[PDB]
């Protein structure tokens, strides 16, 4: 046991937020004062330090644009205790009521924050393995954080967000996260629309290997789709860094699209 462990008696499992093939997610209260969120094991569901190795990644990672670990439980019943994100998933946020008021400036800045989280990941020498809008939590003031490193690792599988070399040959790198970041960029600019519309997994895998790439989403600037294309380069090592992507997006509206005017959607 380590210093990340707490008494479970500390924990008010209150409202329910979701389920899965893993367990649940709950709003709750920690030591009576603190709002938290808990990813649960409903008793047996799966392996101990499989559920509890997303902790071992999340313990050593610690950035403002990453969802924060608060504590863990193995005094079974079992829990992963984390920082509570008020507006839920970026996917739900984009599809929901506020989604449609979202404009490029907002969307680019969300992209930015995420780039920022991932750039930290990048210099910590970790890989996320599952980057996509569904694993981005939104809080107040349009804040976005990376969450659910649930497969993550030191650099020692829903394929539409997955880089070819990673889906096919299991080559997961920060460079394959980048690939996913570019796909994540199509989600933001379409307001949550599933990538590769009308295509099934195997068809996506076959067309992407022949070099098919998603075209510029409607009302999305060419400069922003260029960036997605860079993120989707065949050779992993030619994809840009999260550091370049972070700085590119923060500076976007001055350095890159300094003449942008809003349309009916973006
Ligand atoms: C702890 O373990 C993990 C937990 C999570 N999941 C969450 C964490 C975290 N972290 C924090 N806070 C969350 C808040 C949620 O909903 C709150 C508000 C929802 N509404 C949207 C619609 N409007 C109009 C009302 C508000 C939520 O919904 C499912 C999931 C959350 C992930 Cl993604 C990964 C890991 Cl590893």
């Amino acid at each position: 046991k380590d210093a990340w462990e707490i008494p479970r008696e500390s924990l008010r499992l209150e409202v329910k937020l979701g389920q899965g093939c893993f367990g649940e997610v709950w709003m709750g209260t920690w030591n009576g004062t603190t709002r938290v969120a808990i990813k649960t094991l409903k008793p047996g569901t799966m392996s101990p330090e499989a559920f509890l190795q997303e902790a071992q990644v999340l313990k050593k990672l610690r950035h403002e644009k990453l969802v924060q670990l608060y504590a863990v439980v193995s005094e079974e019943p079992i829990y992963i205790v984390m920082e509570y994100m008020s507006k839920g998933s970026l996917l739900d946020f984009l599809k929901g009521e506020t989604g449609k008021y979202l404009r490029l400036p907002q969307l680019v800045d969300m992209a930015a924050q995420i780039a920022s989280g991932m750039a930290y990941v990048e210099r910590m020498n970790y890989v996320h393995r599952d980057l996509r809008a569904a694993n981005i939590l939104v809080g107040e003031n349009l804040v976005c954080k990376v969450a659910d490193f649930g497969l993550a690792r030191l650099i020692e599988f829903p394929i539409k967000w997955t880089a070819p070399e990673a889906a096919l040959y299991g080559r997961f790198t920060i460079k394959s996260d980048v690939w996913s970041f570019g796909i994540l960029l199509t989600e933001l600019t379409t307001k949550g629309r599933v990538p590769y519309p009308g295509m099934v997994n195997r068809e996506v895998l076959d067309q992407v290997e022949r070099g098919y790439r998603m075209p510029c989403p409607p009302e999305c600037p060419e400069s922003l789709h260029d960036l997605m294309c860079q993120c989707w380069r065949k050779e992993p090592e030619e994809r840009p860094t999260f550091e370049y992507l972070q700085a590119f997006l923060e500076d976007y509206f001055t350095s890159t699209e300094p003449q942008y005017q809003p349309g009916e959607n973006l």
Side-chain angles (χ1 to χ4, degrees), residues 53-62 66 126-127 149-154:
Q53 91 137 76
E54 138 137 39
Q56 335 285 160
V57 187
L58 249 85
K59 289 170 176 184
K60 301 199 141 156
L61 294 167
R62 187 127 175 71
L66 292 207
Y126 287 83
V127 11
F149 288 79
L151 323 134
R153 68 199 216 175
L154 263 315

Side-chain angles (χ1 to χ4, degrees), residues 16-19 24-27 36-40 54 58 67-69 80-89 92-93 97-98 134-138 146-150:
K16 169 132 66 171
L17 292 170
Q19 291 244 200
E24 278 147 71
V25 163
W26 288 67
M27 196 223 281
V36 301
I38 300 103
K39 204 190 187 198
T40 87
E54 138 137 39
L58 249 85
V67 182
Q68 172 182 20
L69 181 76
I80 272 191
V81 177
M82 304 199 38
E83 157 180 28
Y84 176 86
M85 305 295 293
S86 73
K87 312 278 101 145
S89 174
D92 297 344
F93 187 77
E97 194 208 274
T98 315
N135 307 152
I136 312 288
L137 288 150
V138 185
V146 187
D148 203 308
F149 288 79

Side-chain angles (χ1 to χ4, degrees), residues 4-52:
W4 275 108
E5 273 269 349
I6 46 165
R8 164 254 320 309
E9 286 86 20
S10 294
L11 303 174
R12 229 155 93 83
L13 271 276
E14 299 179 0
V15 206
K16 169 132 66 171
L17 292 170
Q19 291 244 200
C21 52
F22 358 95
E24 278 147 71
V25 163
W26 288 67
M27 196 223 281
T29 287
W30 179 29
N31 302 318
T33 318
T34 328
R35 245 252 255 276
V36 301
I38 300 103
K39 204 190 187 198
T40 87
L41 199 43
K42 6 165 256 227
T45 15
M46 69 105 32
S47 165
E49 317 121 338
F51 223 20
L52 282 182

Side-chain angles (χ1 to χ4, degrees), residues 156-214:
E156 295 160 25
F157 242 123
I159 82 118
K160 298 201 230 250
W161 289 263
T162 314
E165 77 266 18
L168 290 186
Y169 313 132
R171 303 181 171 169
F172 289 88
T173 58
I174 189 78
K175 286 311 199 221
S176 52
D177 288 331
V178 173
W179 183 284
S180 323
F181 184 75
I183 304 301
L184 179 35
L185 280 177
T186 57
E187 298 189 294
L188 286 153
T189 59
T190 62
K191 314 279 185 69
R193 285 311 229 119
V194 170
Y196 302 105
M199 300 193 181
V200 291
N201 286 1
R202 183 129 257 110
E203 218 232 300
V204 174
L205 207 75
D206 281 42
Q207 301 314 120
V208 165
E209 277 288 317
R210 310 184 66 256
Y212 171 83
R213 297 292 191 277
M214 287 188 275

